[PDB]
Symmetry: C2
Subunit: 140 residues, 2 copies
């Protein structure tokens, strides 16, 4: 669809920021398409990842960070609010102590800050989706 995927955008985040994403999986859930959102410390795709969010649609969600090149402390969730064949709206809010992921208006995942969100310089959205909206708030 409309936006290029992998989608890369320079970004700054602090408490009160929201990243909003609207997209659709490229395959039915039986084929297990993926979605990934990574908040990076630099514009280079190989830079460290403050917040890694990976959906295997219809199956599970994994969250982690990547620090000095190494994956740290993967956590896993079976919560699966995404619907087979449907467009989704994903919202990632930066709270004082954690990221909160809303899916279609419903709180679905949280991830405690391991690194200050001020370290984020870039967000990348990729894998098996099409993308029609990506927005970061810059109000505060």
């Amino acid at each position: 669809s409309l936006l290029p995927v992998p989608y890369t955008e320079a970004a700054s985040l602090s408490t009160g920021s929201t990243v909003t994403i609207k997209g659709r999986p490229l395959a039915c859930f039986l084929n297990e398409p993926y979605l990934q959102v990574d908040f990076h410390t630099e514009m280079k795709e190989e830079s460290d990842i403050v917040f890694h969010f990976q959906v295997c649609f219809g199956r599970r969600v994994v969250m982690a960070s990547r620090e000095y090149g190494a994956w740290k402390q993967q956590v896993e969730s079976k919560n699966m609010p995404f619907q087979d064949g449907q467009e989704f709206e994903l919202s990632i809010s930066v709270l004082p102590d954690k990221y909160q992921v809303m899916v279609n208006g419903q709180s679905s995942y949280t991830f405690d800050h391991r690194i200050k969100p001020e370290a984020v310089k870039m967000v990348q959205v990729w894998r098996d989706i099409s993308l029609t909206k990506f927005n970061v708030s810059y109000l505060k």
Copy 2:
């Protein structure tokens, strides 16, 4: 690059057929891009899969079949001939008893036929790659 991804092409296979694919991963290996090739029994993406081939670049390869909607007998390989950042050439030959996967000219994976390859009607190539060539032989 040149071909659309997910790439879908109707196909027929028998002993002596070769499927040739040329492409490049969309991300460095540190980001673990995927490649998937599925030989389907019908044109519908939710149809059964005679041969499922999924690379997690730099990590592992999984092979399976999907029969009446259910994944059957996943096998796993740590063989990883693909090179970080490089274009690859993948060849899948239909032998009498198995598929043989060549990577950059080197025999790398084999998968015994669980279903006659005559059941194949469609090949799909997808996930985190760009694609410049896809070819099936029809000589025999």
